[PDB]
Structure formats: C-alpha cells, structure tokens
Design a protein around this motif. Structure first.
Motif, mmCIF file in Angstrom:
data_model
loop_
_atom_site.group_PDB
_atom_site.id
_atom_site.type_symbol
_atom_site.label_atom_id
_atom_site.label_comp_id
_atom_site.label_asym_id
_atom_site.label_seq_id
_atom_site.Cartn_x
_atom_site.Cartn_y
_atom_site.Cartn_z
ATOM 1 N N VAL A 181 0.759 -1.183 -0.120
ATOM 2 C CA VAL A 181 0.123 0.009 -0.030
ATOM 3 C C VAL A 181 0.912 1.369 0.021
ATOM 4 O O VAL A 181 2.076 1.151 0.324
ATOM 5 C CB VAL A 181 -0.988 0.027 1.084
ATOM 6 C CG1 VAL A 181 -1.900 -1.352 0.975
ATOM 7 C CG2 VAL A 181 -0.385 0.230 2.317
ATOM 8 N N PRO A 182 0.371 2.286 -0.671
ATOM 9 C CA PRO A 182 1.188 3.646 -0.511
ATOM 10 C C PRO A 182 1.241 4.118 0.662
ATOM 11 O O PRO A 182 0.119 4.101 1.481
ATOM 12 C CB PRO A 182 0.750 4.537 -1.736
ATOM 13 C CG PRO A 182 -0.651 4.108 -1.849
ATOM 14 C CD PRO A 182 -0.655 2.362 -1.377
ATOM 15 N N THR B 211 0.865 7.159 2.184
ATOM 16 C CA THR B 211 0.055 7.932 2.561
ATOM 17 C C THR B 211 -1.103 7.402 3.054
ATOM 18 O O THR B 211 -2.134 7.900 3.675
ATOM 19 C CB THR B 211 -0.320 8.954 1.270
ATOM 20 O OG1 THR B 211 -0.997 10.170 1.926
ATOM 21 C CG2 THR B 211 -0.858 8.434 0.378
ATOM 22 N N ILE B 212 -1.476 6.085 2.710
ATOM 23 C CA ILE B 212 -2.445 5.414 3.230
ATOM 24 C C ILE B 212 -1.694 4.439 4.205
ATOM 25 O O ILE B 212 -0.288 4.421 4.370
ATOM 26 C CB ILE B 212 -3.450 4.723 2.198
ATOM 27 C CG1 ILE B 212 -3.693 5.691 1.124
ATOM 28 C CG2 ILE B 212 -4.618 4.071 2.899
ATOM 29 C CD1 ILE B 212 -4.411 4.766 0.038
ATOM 30 N N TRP C 227 5.780 1.821 3.369
ATOM 31 C CA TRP C 227 4.749 1.140 2.550
ATOM 32 C C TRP C 227 4.448 -0.083 3.242
ATOM 33 O O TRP C 227 5.319 -0.856 3.574
ATOM 34 C CB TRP C 227 5.741 0.678 1.204
ATOM 35 C CG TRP C 227 5.957 1.870 0.230
ATOM 36 C CD1 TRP C 227 7.183 2.477 0.341
ATOM 37 C CD2 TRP C 227 5.449 2.200 -0.972
ATOM 38 N NE1 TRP C 227 7.238 3.722 -0.521
ATOM 39 C CE2 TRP C 227 5.876 3.312 -1.259
ATOM 40 C CE3 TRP C 227 4.136 1.940 -1.442
ATOM 41 C CZ2 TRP C 227 5.802 4.063 -2.507
ATOM 42 C CZ3 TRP C 227 3.744 2.408 -2.631
ATOM 43 C CH2 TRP C 227 4.691 3.599 -3.303
#
Lengths: 60, 122, 203, 204, 371
Positions: free
Chosen positions: D19-20, D22-23, D181
């Motif tokens: 997942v990126p 920022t999430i 990440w």
RNA sequence: UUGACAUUGUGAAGAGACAUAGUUUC
RNA sequence: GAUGGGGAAGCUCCGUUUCAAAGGCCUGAUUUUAUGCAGGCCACCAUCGAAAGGGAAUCCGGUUAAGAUUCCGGAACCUGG
RNA sequence: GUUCUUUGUAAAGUGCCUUCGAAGAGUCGAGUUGUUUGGGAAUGCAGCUCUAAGUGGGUGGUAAAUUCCAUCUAAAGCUAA
RNA sequence: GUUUGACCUCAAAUCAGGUAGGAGUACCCGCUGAACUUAAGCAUAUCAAUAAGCGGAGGAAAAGAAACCAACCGGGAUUGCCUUAGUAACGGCGAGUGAAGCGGCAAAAGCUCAAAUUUGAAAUCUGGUACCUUCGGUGCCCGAGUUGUAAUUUGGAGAGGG
RNA sequence: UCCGUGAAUCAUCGAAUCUUUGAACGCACAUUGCGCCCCUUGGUAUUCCAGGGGGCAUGCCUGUUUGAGCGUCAUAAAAUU
C-alpha cells in the motif's frame, strides 16, 4: 346503489380504489399536478415579487 | 475471540425469514361482483324435439339446453333448486350448433311427466 | 470544504495513491454483475457537478461495458458488393462508449430517468462507468422546482435520443464554424439544403 | 455466498498488495485505552437532540415577546462539531482543538488529506477506530470526522492533557510515517512455504 | 380424474402438527402457547394416528387445522409483532445510548387489548357467567403468594384490587349461600342471577413457589382473567346501578386494607339468607381471622368491630363476641359467646342454630359439608 | 501468423548512470 | 425452451444444472433473559414434446330414421376418502 | 368591478469605501486507425495509446518556430413563439 | 468482550406504495446501412451521409442564452424565409458535388446549479397516522439525511466589512 | 291516459356493464389443461364433496419488516497479612 354506498365510506381519504378514481387518460394520470407546476423555487419567488412584469402604455 | 457457529453442512442455503400477508390500504375492485352463474343463468331451455319425448317415458329423463360454462355439478344443483327434484345422474354433450345439451335422469321416486306439465311445454 | 481536496486530487490519476486504490476497485468491480447498484457515489464532488444531491430519488448504478471496436455481424465476414469496404474489425461505432452504458441501464430501470454519467475506472477489456438516475414518481422530486422539469414526459430516455452531455458531444452539437455541417442536427440541416423551395410567383 | 466471498477476498487483497504510505498511516490508529478516555470527554459534549431543540424554542418563544432577548436569554452552545465540510471549514481558519479521524470510510479518499492538512495547520488530531462510534456521539449513524472548538472552563485540564498525550502518541512520531509502504504480508500457506524453502536452504 | 395421491385428504388435511402449526403461523413456540389460551385452541385427537401422520407411530399432538386456518387472521397477532420491534429498537436506543429518543418511545406504544376477543367468545353476558368459576380461582391463589420472580411484584397489587371489588359486590348485595371450610381454603357458592358459583379463598400462607410450571404462562392466564373480570363487574355494578370501579380509601387501605374501604355509590333482599343477623352487631376478639369473618357477616346483614382496629385505634353497642380462644375472661353478661363454627352452620341452613352449643370451648360437629 | 504497446504487480543475481550516500538505463 | 448469468447499437443471442443465498422437515418446560426463538435433520432444481411407445379399472343382452364398450336392462370393477 | 383579509420593522432595490472574488479531468490536447465533410495537411465524430495547465484555456479556415493582438469561458442544466 | 449493541454490506417477502413494456410511427431524435443508377466498361467517385433494419419521444420535437461571429465606427441565444450563391471550395480537378459570415424580415425571453461554515443551534424532506375547508393543509410518529438536505451567489457578476 | 317523468336503430353522454383473449401478468397452451391461497354458502358434514366471491407475473424505485457475513470484534503484565 352499492357504488354510491362505497364512495362515502371511502370519501375523504387517500388511496381509494383505482376503478373509482379518475379515468382521464394514461398521460394525465401521470403529468404533475396543478400544485406541482405552480410550485416555484424560493429565489425566483423573491425575484417575481421584487420585479413583476409591470403594465404600461406608450402614449404621452 | 471468535466462536464461529459449527456448520457440518457443506452447503449454505437461503435462511428462512418472515413473509407477510398483504395489508391493502384500499380494496381491489371496490364492489364484490355478483354471481355470474346462478340457476336461471345455467339452465336455458328445454329441448322439445320428438326424440326427447322418448326418453321422457322410456328413460324418466329430462333434457335441457345448458349454458357453455356450466358443468355436471352445476347442472345437478340448479335443477335441484328450480324444481326440488332428486337427480340420479347427468350425462352431457355438446351439440354441433354450439350449445351444450344435458340429459338429466331423475331418481326413481319422482316423475318426469309431472314436472313437464309444471314447466309448460309438453 | 473537502470539495477541492478530492477534485484537485482526482486529476492525479497516475499517482501512486490512486493507482493502488484504483487497482483495488477494478478487482472488486469485475466480481459483481455487469450492472449493479452502487450504494453510494465514489466521486461525490464529481457527482455534485453533474447535479447529484443526496436525497430519496437518486440512484447510482455502477456499470461495465466492453472496450474495443465494433465488428459488423455479417456471416463469415462477407461484404457482398463493392469490395472497397476495408477490414471488418475497423468499423468504429459513431457513439461513444459512455453513451452505451447509459442505454444499457436505461433499458433496465425504465421507471428511472437517466440524468448523467461519468468515467470511473477502466481496463484493457472493460471500461466502467457510474450513472446518476432520478425517479420522477418520487414526491420529493415532484416538488423542489430545481428538478421537477424532468418529470415532464418529453424527457423519457434522454440517452436513447442522445440528449445528455455526452449525447450532445457524440452528435457533435456546438456553435462555431467548425460545426457547420451539424449545428442544428445533421439530418435536419441536410434536409433543408436539399429541398427545392417554390414560391407562388416564381422568383 | 458471493457477497460474503467478495468481502473476505477484498480484505485479503488489501493486505497482500503494497500500500502507498500516505495510506496506512491509517490502522496505526489510536489504542483502545486512550480512546475510551476520549469518548468520556465527548459524550459530555453531545449535540442537542431534536426534543431539546424543539423545547428550547418554546422556552424562548415564551420569552421573546414576554421578556426581552434576541434569544439571548438562551445560553451559549457547547457541543462537538461534526459536519465534514464544517470540520474543514473550522480547520484552516483555524478554530479546532482536536479533530478525530475514522479509519474506515468506503471512499477512503474523503479523508486521506486531513492528517497531512492538520500537520500543516498545526492542528492536534487523532485517528480513531470506528466511524459508527463517531456517529453515536452525534446522533447520526456514521460521522467519519469529529472535531471540537471550545470547552467549558473546568473541563480544560483533562483536554489539555490529552492534546499533549495524543500528539506525542501520534503527530510528532508520524512524519516518518511518510515512509513505510505497508501491506507486504503473505498468507500462512505461503508463509510456511517460504520458511521451508529458506530454512532448509540454511540447515538440515 | 387422475388417481389422487393418498396422503392429502381426510385425516391429513384435517389435522396438522404443532411444528407445522408454528411454521405456518411464522411466530414462535411460546407465543403459540399464548394464543392457544387466548382463543384458546385445545389440541385434538384423530381417530387414527398412523393415517394422520403418514405412517409414523410417534408422539405428536394435533390441532384441527381449520382452527389455525381461522387463527391466522387475529388482530392480536399483529401487536405481538409490533411489540417485538419495540424490543429491538429500544436496545438500540440504549446500546447507542440516547435517552431522549428512548423513553419517548415508551409512551408511544400500545398494549394489545382483549375486548373484541371475549365478546365473541362469550355472547355476551350469561355465557361467561357460567364459566366465571374457573376464572376466579387462580386470582385468589395468585393474590396469596409472596414476591417472587416471573411474577414481578407489580402484579400482586392488582389482584388485591380486583378481588376486593368482587367481595364488595357480594357483601353489598348479600348473596353467600353454601360455605364450607377445608384445609384447602373456604369453599363458597353464590347464586348470582340464576347460575351459581362455588369459589374459593385459600388460606393466606406464603407457601413456596414450586417452580415446575412455567410462570411466563400463568401471567397470560392472569391477564386473560383480568380483562374478563373488568367487563363482568363493570356490568354487575351498573346492573345494580352502582359506579365502577369503586374508589378505595387509602388510609382504610392502611387500616386493614379491607372491606371497610372501597366505598360504592349508584349511577328488599333475597329472603331468607340475606338480611339474616340484621341490626345485630358483633365485636370480635383479637385472635380471630377477620379476613374470613368480616365478609361473612356483612354479606348477612351484620356489623363488625374488631380488636384488630383497637391496637392501632368504647364497646357498648355490640351483641356478641365471636371468639376462637381456649379461655375467655372476663366476659360480658349482656353479650353472648360462640366459636365461629356457629357462623357456618347458620348460613349453611339459614335456620339460625342457637349460640348455646358452641360457647367456647364446648364441642363441635366439624362441618357437615353442604354438598 | 509474427512483432510492439496496454492489460501488468512484488523481488533477486549478471551487463549501462548519480561521478564510488539508493531515487533507476541492459 | 425461460430463469441464474454472459454477449449483442439493437431486433435479440447463448446455454438447461449451469460461477445463484435456487426449500422443507423435526423437537421443545431451549430453563429462564423475564413480554424479542432455540436446537436439529434433509442435502436437487421451470416447462413443453407420442389421439400408434409408457399408461388404474366394463362386460353382455336390448333399443333409434340416424347415437352407442357412452342410453336402458342386468352383472362387474378401479381409485380416493 | 365589488368585497374580505392586509402584512412588516418582513423582504427586495439603489450609493460610496475596503477586502476579496471559489467557476466543471481520462476531460482539454496530441498521435494513430476508421468513417464523414466544401473543409482543403485534416470538417466532425469514434476506437486505441499518450495525457495538461491556472494572469490559464479555446478560437482567429495552410505546414512550423518566435513575438503580438483580438475575442470568448469548455468539459454541468432549463427554457414559449 | 465464548457476550451486548451498533455500523457496513447484501438479500428477503402475494410487504406498504408506485412504475416499465404494447399500439401508432405523417412530421421529430438517434444508430445502423446497401445496390441498381451516373461516371466507358470500373476497384476512387456517383446515387448517398439516401431506401430497407433497429432504438426513443411529442403536439410539436430538436436547438437555444457564445469556450460565437468578426477584424469593423465592430456585432450579440436559438429557429425559419429571402438573399449570399450554384459562388469560395472539393473531385481519375472527370462525371459531378457544394457550404457558411454579413443584409432584410418573421418571431422575439430569458435563465439555473456545481464550486464560499447556518454553525448561536438541518434551519430541509418522504411516509405512517389523526383531524382538515383536500390537486392540498395542520398535528403526531417511524424515518431520511452531515460521505450534506434548506436559505445565500453563477461571472453580466458577486461575497464580507464600514 | 293525449296534457305526459315520455315513442326513438333519434340526439347527447359525465353512470355502469364489459365473454374468452391479447404488451397479457398463477403455470401452461396444437389443450377450453393443471395448480396454490383466502373468505363464504350448500349437501346429513370436524375430515368428504360442491358452488360462490377474492387472490398468486417480471424488472425497478421509495419505504416498512425480517434477515444474513470474524466486512468491521480482538491487548495489557505483574504481585502481599
């Protein structure tokens, strides 16, 4: 006799049976009521009062 | 913590649930329509061909033109109402004009002669 | 409010946050049926600028169409005539793809009215769309004069006559000298200038 | 059934893929312990229910023509602020003290800018688990945000502790959460698979 | 006619299973038991079970499926399903935690009523009058036992009040006929308008709840007889012409909680049993149970003052002292002295046996039960 | 039929850059 | 040859038990949740398609201008309750 | 025309000064194929690739670069004759 | 916390209430889409952006308030006629095809949302139900709804403060 | 009755009827085929039988009611007369 007997007990209430409703046509049993066409936004209702289409005449 | 409910079935089915009865706000057709098929509607005319007179005496049998939607039960009742006569049995057929003829054999107690005078044709 | 914080973000489609989140959603969207009910708008601000308001009488259908070209359904690929006609896979289907998805739900929810539609997600095999639909029977829509114009029965199936925004674009209806061949409508202005006018006193 | 079988595999698919970062600043959410302390605070500050709302007029409708007020015989409000624009409206002025964030919003992108926004605007904030409990403190079903502007006088010191408590637990540590990440986890059959492939590479 | 598949007609159509009945009503187990008291469908027997049950020799009770076919309409059944939702939404109102919406809902709900169901079950007056006997008996039993669970000490307090209005009518109108004492309370009989009702006041002892019968059930028994006995006594006072319900006196409710209280008002007698003992006034001792002396004497023209009203608090007017004591000292020469057995043998006959015999503690014929 | 692109992610080792702090051309 | 679905600008096409939550049966004093159902069992699927296939059971005598294993007379039989 | 109700300190309008002034993205655009147009080195639409910006963008009927000017405000919507 | 209860998600009902299909199809809006024909014969072209096919409306439809036209001393939603003009243009530059601007007239009418916090009080609404003077009104109640319903402002402006 | 509640293949039309059908809608259909539910009446009738009356299409919306899914539930150690 029976139909006019039925009308008074169903008088004055929403949802009376379809056969005793209006027949008028399939279009007009759709097709927004007089209230629903007269119903206007609030804003132009302000606009209608502030400047209604006036009456005038060009003579002199 | 989790206690899953033990399922020994492998197959999951739609769970049962509540299924209402209808609660109409208004009636269906606003008048219960009257009887389509009373006695006078059913039995139309007697059939006064000369061969019908044969089965009057020899059969103790009346013959009638019966409306098309009727059947052997409804014939049996409507006779028994309009004349108060016990029917042994009713055979029917359809005449090729388009009508439904029905032989009505009365019971042994009653007479076809008496009703024939009472109905007016003879 | 959070109007622009989505919208300015929503343009950033190749960004890492989206192309993750997009790739999650495309997997989910394949699993459902071709047409299914999205319970709530994915892009509400994008739905706002089409005209969605959140009240009873506004349905969002997520919808999926097949990407590609338009193959002519001749048997065995035969043309029968002037062999000038080139490859059967090269027929290109005048309407947009977006116009298909409106009609594909428009035949389904006939009681509804197809307001507008927009892109959500895509793939080599499918493109996806999200369509806003409005009930004219619902009493909240029959009042509220900002919307009750659609209850007029001349707005039945605007997508099939192609009267949406993307309907007007695929028909190609705007002002300007680049639009002379259809500005009022392709056939209608064709029929005008192919017509012999005859006045009584013959000019 | 499929809707079962969809929502499970999506939960898998969220966690298998990288997942990126920022999430998944989400789900480093608040502990249950300090959040339980928080809900005691906000339940003191519920917004007015419709019954009290209906009543409050009828008191002052019996006071406007009768005594003298432009409804100023009525007291001053104290409640949370909960409108999503109205939170973002109360940020950037700024006027908030604490802003809550629900971890799960189905369009997640409704939220994801807020923690970065509060970091820039100096707003102390926190990610709580559960939008539904955010609804319960406000008499909605779900809320997805929860903010608070003012507070009565005695109630300050408990608030002032939590703000210091949260930001150390959250906002200070979590600039380097621009990295990490997340979502590289495997399933357990694969987890046992990679071990035996590597452990029996290393030993016998 | 296409040969017709044996297991449909006759026995298979006429009866169904408990399990099938609950399935077709779509309600629950115990609510079906609640309705089978309300209507109340008693289960039946076929005269051939193995035909009734597809070959299955099995313990199974059956139900005259036409009655369940009748039972499905039943406007009571809706309000059960109304009330289930009330138990749903309320727990949400507290589980979220919101009082203002919650105890708004309490005042916006409707208890079911039994009004239509009785006036069809008893058309109208005299039918239930024959059957009022079995109704009264649990009421005095349920007004006896102390405060236990699945009873909910609310419910004791009504049966106090309803039974009081029962005695209030009879002592006013003076109709007590055949009085018998056992160890199972005191048996009665009252010829109330033709039909005659034996009934019972048990001995007031807080004996234990056995807890083998289910006390979810007998509340529905209790509610059934209550809403019956409203419209019975509502007529019976207004048949006599009296108001209903009689207001009690709350400090007489703290005197004896008894027949001094509960005054009646409106808007010659039976002869012989009514207007016996008339203008003929008793002052009882302290030992004696005025619970069962007082209603006896008022319902035969006689007036009572008790020593039980003297501990809380002149004695010049009265005629006798009914006394149930070994020794009596020192007694009044102007007063005549019995044991309360004399009350029974008089009104068992209405023939007024003398006060000479019993005269404590001279021996007794035990009862000679009047049946 | 063959090729390219898109669908299409996470990684490692051997061949081009920071000119030999980790963001990437074979 | 519908439905589940999937194609197809569309008329419609595909397929027929399938990538479906595709019903129906039992026990109850579910032992207290106090006035909300509990515990089991069973594990497939529209319909159409033979007046020569498959298929519950009727015989004889008599009788009419014309009908008859169908009426009458007598004597049977099947099915379901 | 007659007549009843009026509502309101309720709304609307107008001047000066000062801060501002939110304006639509797989869109715009470009390439490519196909079709179409008087539109010609591309009039339009559509497929597939690529994919914008904010003193920006479109257009100014010949291919580009560079500097101008002129003119409108896209990708949301209604509306008699 | 083996529990309670939300919430989400998706179902289910002979559930309460609605709604859709078909006909017609002169004209209207779309899509799809030929060939005989004329070019010598013909694979460009032509017939033709037509006929048949399919989808969808109305008494009109559509279009309609500039991402316009111009290059002027500038005009000003759309439609229709007369002109422009068989012209600029296109094309085995062959057959052929073929516009729009301005001018005059008919008819003339303008507008709404998105996107700025009401925050001192969602001020909004469907339904149920009861009365009512009933194309509706009012009360009460389940609701909906803050992942945003009313008021406020749509570029010509406008908002806030004074 | 002709001094009228009144002829008529009259006119007009606002109240009704409307077989079986048909988009055709309980299931079917080359058949007057086969169900299911509810109410009511009758035949000696708790069962049997018959009549009558009213119901049972699909998609979709809004709502109500009933649901279902570890989708979201999970965290503290330590220690004394």
């Amino acid at each position: 006799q029976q139909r006019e007997a039925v009308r008074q007990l169903y008088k004055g209430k929403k949802y009376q049976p379809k056969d005793l409703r209006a027949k008028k046509t399939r279009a007009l049993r759709r097709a927004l009521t007089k209230f629903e066409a007269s119903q206007v936004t609030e804003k132009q209702r302000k606009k209608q009062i502030a400047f209604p289409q006036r009456k005038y005449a060009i003579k002199a | 913590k989790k206690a899953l409910k033990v399922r020994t079935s492998a197959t999951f089915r739609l769970p049962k649930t509540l299924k209402l009865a209808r609660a109409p706000k208004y009636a269906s057709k606003a008048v219960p329509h009257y009887n389509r098929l009373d006695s006078y509607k059913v039995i139309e005319q007697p059939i006064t061909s000369e061969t019908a007179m044969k089965k009057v005496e020899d059969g103790n049998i009346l013959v009638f033109q019966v409306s098309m939607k009727a059947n052997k039960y409804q014939i049996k009742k409507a006779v028994k109402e309009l004349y108060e006569v016990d029917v042994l049995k009713v055979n029917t057929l359809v005449r090729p004009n388009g009508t439904k003829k029905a032989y009505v054999r009365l019971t042994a107690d009653y007479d076809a002669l008496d009703i024939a005078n009472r109905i007016g044709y003879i | 409010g959070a109007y622009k914080y989505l919208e300015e973000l929503q343009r950033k489609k190749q960004s890492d946050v989206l192309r993750f989140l997009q790739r999650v959603r495309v997997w989910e969207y394949r699993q459902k049926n071709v047409i299914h009910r999205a319970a709530r708008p994915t892009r509400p601000d994008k739905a706002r600028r089409l005209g969605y308001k959140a009240k009873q009488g506004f349905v969002i259908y997520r919808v999926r169409v097949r990407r590609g070209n338009r193959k002519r359904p001749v048997p065995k690929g035969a043309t029968y005539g002037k062999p000038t006609n080139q490859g059967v896979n090269e027929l290109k289907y005048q309407r947009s793809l977006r116009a298909t998805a409106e009609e594909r739900v428009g035949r389904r929810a006939a009681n509804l009215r197809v307001l507008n539609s927009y892109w959500v997600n895509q793939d080599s095999t499918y493109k996806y769309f999200e369509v806003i639909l409005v009930d004219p029977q619902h009493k909240a829509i029959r009042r509220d004069a900002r919307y009750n114009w659609i209850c007029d029965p001349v707005h039945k199936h605007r997508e099939a006559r192609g009267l949406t925004a993307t309907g007007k674009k695929s028909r190609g209806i705007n002002k300007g000298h680049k639009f002379n061949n259809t500005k009022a409508g392709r056939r209608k202005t064709w029929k005008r200038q192919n017509t012999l006018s005859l006045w009584r006193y013959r000019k | 059934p499929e809707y079962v079988r969809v929502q499970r595999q999506k939960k898998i698919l969220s966690i298998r893929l990288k997942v990126p970062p920022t999430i998944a600043q989400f789900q480093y959410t608040l502990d249950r312990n300090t959040a339980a302390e928080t809900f005691k605070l906000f339940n003191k500050y519920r917004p007015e229910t419709a019954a009290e709302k209906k009543e409050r007029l009828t008191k002052e409708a019996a006071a406007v023509a009768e005594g003298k007020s432009k409804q100023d015989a009525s007291p001053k409000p104290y409640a949370v602020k909960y409108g999503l624009n109205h939170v973002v409206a109360l940020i950037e002025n700024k006027k908030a003290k604490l802003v809550l964030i629900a971890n799960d919003v189905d369009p997640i992108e409704l939220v994801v800018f807020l923690p970065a926004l509060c970091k820039k605007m100096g707003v102390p904030y926190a990610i709580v688990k559960g939008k539904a409990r955010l609804g319960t403190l406000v008499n909605q079903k779900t809320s997805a945000v929860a903010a608070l502007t003012e507070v009565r006088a005695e109630d300050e010191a408990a608030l002032a502790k939590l703000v210091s408590t949260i930001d150390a637990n959250f906002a200070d540590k979590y600039d380097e959460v621009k990295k990490h990440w997340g979502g590289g986890i495997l399933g357990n059959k694969a987890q046992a698979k990679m071990d035996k492939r590597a452990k029996n590479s290393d030993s016998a | 006619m296409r040969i017709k598949k044996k297991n449909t007609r006759g026995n298979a159509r006429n009866f169904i299973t408990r399990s099938q009945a609950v399935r077709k009503l779509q309600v629950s187990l115990a609510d079906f038991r609640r309705l089978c008291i309300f209507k109340g469908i008693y289960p039946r027997e076929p005269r051939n079970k193995k035909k009734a049950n597809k070959g299955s020799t099995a313990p199974t009770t059956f139900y005259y499926a036409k009655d369940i076919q009748y039972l499905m309409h039943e406007p009571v059944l809706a309000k059960f399903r109304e009330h289930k939702t009330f138990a749903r939404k309320l727990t949400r109102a507290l589980g979220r935690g919101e009082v203002s919406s919650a105890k708004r809902l309490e005042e916006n709900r409707d208890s079911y009523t039994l009004d239509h169901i009785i006036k069809e079950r008893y058309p109208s007056f005299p039918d239930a009058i024959r059957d009022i006997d079995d109704a009264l008996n649990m009421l005095f039993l349920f007004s006896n036992l102390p405060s236990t669970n699945q009873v909910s000490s609310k419910i004791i307090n009504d049966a106090q009040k309803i039974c009081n209005q029962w005695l209030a009518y009879v002592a006013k109108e003076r109709l007590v006929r055949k009085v018998f004492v056992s160890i199972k309370g005191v048996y009665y009989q009252a010829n109330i308008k033709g039909e005659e009702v034996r009934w019972l006041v048990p001995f007031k002892f807080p004996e234990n709840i056995p807890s083998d019968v289910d006390f979810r059930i007998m509340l529905t028994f209790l509610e059934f007889y209550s809403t019956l006995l409203h419209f019975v006594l509502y007529k019976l006072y207004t048949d006599s012409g009296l108001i209903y319900p009689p207001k009690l006196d709350l400090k007489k409710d703290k005197i004896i909680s008894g027949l001094s209280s509960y005054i009646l008002e409106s808007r010659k007698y039976d002869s012989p049993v009514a207007s016996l003992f008339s203008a003929f006034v008793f002052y009882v001792s302290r030992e004696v149970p005025i619970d069962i002396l007082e209603f006896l004497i008022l319902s035969c023209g006689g007036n009572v003052i008790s020593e039980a009203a003297m501990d809380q608090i002149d004695m010049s007017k009265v005629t006798h002292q009914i006394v149930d004591r070994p020794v009596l000292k020192n007694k009044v020469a102007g007063r005549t002295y019995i044991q309360p057995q004399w009350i029974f043998d008089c009104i068992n006959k209405g023939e007024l046996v003398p006060a000479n015999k019993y005269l404590p503690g001279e021996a007794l014929p035990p009862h000679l039960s009047p049946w």
